[PDB]
Structure 1
Amino acid sequence: GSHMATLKVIGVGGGGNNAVNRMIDHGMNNVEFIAINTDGQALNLSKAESKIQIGEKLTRGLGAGANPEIGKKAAEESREQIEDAIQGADMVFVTSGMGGGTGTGAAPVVAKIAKEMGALTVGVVTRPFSFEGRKRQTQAAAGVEAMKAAVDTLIVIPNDRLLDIVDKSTPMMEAFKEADNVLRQGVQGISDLIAVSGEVNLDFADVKTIMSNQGSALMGIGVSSGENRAVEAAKKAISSPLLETSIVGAQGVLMNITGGESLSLFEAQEAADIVQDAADEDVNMIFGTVINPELQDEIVVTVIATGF
């Protein structure tokens, strides 16, 4: 029979659950969301179908007060509830803001549980703005390292990079949605990859081969049309200004190209060469293609890059 991969997204702490709420608002089908927090007031406002309040004995329903040991102990003491919410997932994305008490301490525990439950486990986490100061940055760094030890693959977004994509008036929430896009489009690209049978078919086992026990990762999508569409879509897929880990140095890549019946062999090679050239390495590519005739002149390039 056919395989039906279960994808879950888990928000851990305030920033993580913020990202979950905004992704739910944007709309996202066939993904299950789990909200995990110490802060009962925030959790009450979560849109997630599955909510886990952790650490109530430790915090009396408050946040962790910037103490990552409390976040860690809260998650460990709710291990069974976390296991029960995860059970059945083939893939888990853990999103969290590093530098506070709950995200920094609980997110690596959640990631460890997911991996021990058999899920392919991806972290997507932020580092604090420099204006939040050195102690927050240093706590966040310890969280990042703990995440790296617990996940299969880790995507880090330094919040300082948001200062590169705003003008003096861009609302903070609009900036936050740009960071959200990294996780949302990564999840959606995998979901679409699994849902469709491709002319050159990639599936969840190929995702596992590229992401399992790899470390840093890049996940990107590019869309373009018209002249030079394949090159432009490929460049967009690999060129986010928000990432700590760029494409440079990638040694493994999963690339899927979707287009209409006009999709040419020549432009598929162009797109693949863009990614190889940018990595500046001998890349082990897993290459796929999907013909969607509903598409007209549009091409979509999806990239997952690892092996750094």
Structure 2
Amino acid sequence: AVIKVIGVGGGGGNAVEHMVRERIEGVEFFAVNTDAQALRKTAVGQTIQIGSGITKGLGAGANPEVGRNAADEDREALRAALDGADMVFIAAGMGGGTGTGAAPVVAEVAKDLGILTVAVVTKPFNFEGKKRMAFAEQGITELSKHVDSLITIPNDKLLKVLGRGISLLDAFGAANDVLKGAVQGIAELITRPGLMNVDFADVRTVMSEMGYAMMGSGVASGEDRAEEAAEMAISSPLLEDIDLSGARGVLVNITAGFDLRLDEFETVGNTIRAFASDNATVVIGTSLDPDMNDELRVTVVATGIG
């Protein structure tokens, strides 16, 4: 169908501008920011200024009540842009003023409109403050009762992965490729009418377990490309504690060429029910694309972290 990504705040808009000018199929991007200076120079072709009568183009400050109230009084503006959609993604970095407050408001618009919403957040760095981590912890409660799926990319685990003195654009961009793989992973799943076919309906029942989520795409090629793709797709090194045990909903998609083997299918599916052996449901897909070469792809969604 058609899908949308609403990235609120300046950091959420930073995820959007990378996605613009790529080859995009059936996806439109909306930028939300209380502060209008960040929306001045962006590659995204549409911009939304929220709280223009309450800030006149400025941010939310260190008090997120300014960012919460600015989005609250422009709830008329959020509903109009969210039309004709059935999957929205909330891109933000929690811990600040706007993204801590405005992102639940877009979720509140999303939940009021009967749409399936998934929020992607980044918990801040530890050195930037521990007192400000407290309301960032309470900001999770602000998002735990309004969003079906909590995607978290904590910044305290940013240095432990590729700690070779990478660029600040690169480690920020690594979290962006998590969300881009999340957006493109759902998009390639539903749009493609494979030999076996998963669409929106069994997508919807997976992350309705109301818990923490994790969704990324592992790509492998080789003789044992099935185990390398299954283990890469389940590995999310950019989280504090993934806590795969006690999950309540699993969604697996398999993509391979016409040389796809039952040994390849089982060994991807062999590692998925080891932690999902509890009283929980697992949805499995399969796709057979003839034009693309021997590269294999596995997309895994795991929601319901209890």
State the TM-score, normalizing by the size of structure 1. 0.94
CA contact (8 A) 1:97 1:128 kept: yes
Residue identity opposite 2:274 in structure 1 = D
Partner of 2:251: 254
2:224 to 223, 228, 251: 228
Residue identity opposite 1:74 in structure 2 = A
Secondary structure of 1:286's counterpart equals: strand
1:193 to 184, 189, 193: 189
Farther off after superposition, 137-146 or 104-113:
137-146
Residue identity opposite 2:84 in structure 1 = G
Summarize the Cα distance change of 1:45–1:96 in structure 2 as closer, same or farther, 3 Å threshold.
same
CA contact (8 A) 1:152 1:214 kept: yes
2:15 to 5, 15, 19: 19
Q: Is the aligned partner of 1:181 residue 2:159?
A: no
Residue identity opposite 2:272 in structure 1 = V
Q: CA deviation at 1:45?
A: 2.1
CA contact (8 A) 1:35 1:46 kept: no
Mapping for residues 94-173 of structure 1, pairs under 5 Å: 94-173=90-169
Q: Is the aligned partner of 1:64 residue 2:57?
A: no
Secondary structure of 2:14's counterpart equals: helix
Deviations 1:22-46 (A, max 9, x none): 2225553321111111111101223
Secondary structure of 2:157's counterpart equals: helix
Deviations 1:221-274 (A, max 9, x none): 111111211111010001011024343332321101000001112211110111
1:55 to 46, 51, 58: 51
Summarize the Cα distance change of 1:136–1:21 in structure 2 as closer, same or farther, 3 Å threshold.
farther
Farther off after superposition, 245-254 or 292-301:
245-254
Distance in 2 between residues matched to 1:58 and 1:134, nearest whole Å: 29
Mapping for residues 281-296 of structure 1, pairs under 5 Å: 281=278, 283-296=280-293
Secondary structure of 2:255's counterpart equals: strand
Distance in 1 between residues matched to 2:304 and 2:209, nearest whole Å: 10
Unaligned runs of 5+ in 1: none
Summarize the Cα distance change of 1:215–1:49 in structure 2 as closer, same or farther, 3 Å threshold.
farther
CA contact (8 A) 2:248 2:280 kept: yes
Q: Is the aligned partner of 1:277 residue 2:268?
A: no
Q: Quick one: percent identity of the two aligned structures? A: 53
Distance in 2 between residues matched to 1:118 and 1:283, nearest whole Å: 25
CA contact (8 A) 1:125 1:156 kept: yes
Distance in 2 between residues matched to 1:273 and 1:213, nearest whole Å: 23
Unaligned runs of 5+ in 2: none
Distance in 2 between residues matched to 1:207 and 1:195, nearest whole Å: 13
Q: How many residues align?
A: 304
CA contact (8 A) 2:2 2:85 kept: yes
Partner of 1:90: 86
CA contact (8 A) 1:238 1:246 kept: no
Distance in 2 between residues matched to 1:248 and 1:22, nearest whole Å: 34
Summarize the Cα distance change of 1:236–1:278 in structure 2 as closer, same or farther, 3 Å threshold.
farther
